[PDB]
Ligand SMILES: *[B@@]1([O])O[C]([C]C([O])=O)[C]=[C][C][C]1[N]C(=O)[C]C1=[C][C]=[C]S1
């Protein structure tokens with residue numbers, strides 16, 4: 021709809037920030053796009069690509085997810101909800117992936133990054149999939165600075181929607197690995213006020229949120245509406261003031277506009 025475009029523009033205006041939306045509707049292979057080719061800081065939405073890279077690696081190393089990783093005090097960063105419970109012990113790569121995806125643990129993300137060879141290796145994995153837009157430049161916590169004009173740790177809504185579709189509904193990952201990614205995303209604990217908040221209660225959602233400087237507030241989701249083909253939705257939002265507050269409501273509103 022041109023109506024949908026007008027409503028998204030209205031939402032953006034009211035919000036004071038910059039909104040990026042990409043919806044893929046697998047029912048009819050249509051898209052709804054708003055600033056979908058602009059770059060936005062991914063913040064923790066990048067953790068999907070890092071977990072996917074480990075899942076890919078596990079297809080040629082079948083006991084990889086059980087591999088143990090030491091957690092030390094020196095690993096702690098700014099937000100360690102799961103890793104702080106495991107200091108001086110080990111977590112498996114499966115546990116780290118779950119912590120990164122479901123609690124947005126930042127130590128967990130740094131262990132996924134390190135395992136696969138660093139930010140440039142996560143980026144090369146994206147390229148191998150056909151995503152030529154995604155770039156992961158830094159580790160946690162600095163990858164979330166979200167400075168306007170800074171291309172580090174950014175992607176576009178279009179690219180991220182196409183990539184999430186490939187990862188969750190397509191064939192980027194083997195069936196076991198794809199199912200594990202989907203299960204992890206469906207068990208997310210951080211997204212109930214974001215895309216989920218703009219959809220009917222009966223719909224099933226797997227999502228990953230992100231937040232960072234400049235009031236950056238993000239969510240990427242695979243959605244199974246009741247008796248419908250699935251949708252992929254990326255909603256990215258960022259604001260002009262360095263210390264702007266979170267605006268999860270804006271993502272909920274965008275989700276409601278594009279699925280109404
Ligand atoms: B990451 O972006 O994911 C979130 C998800 C959310 O808010 O729903 C929460 C915690 C980990 C992430 N965010 C941050 O680390 C915030 C910042 C880090 C450095 C500067 S701001």
Ligand SMILES: [Cl-]
Nearest residue numbers: 219220221222
């Ligand atoms: Cl409802």
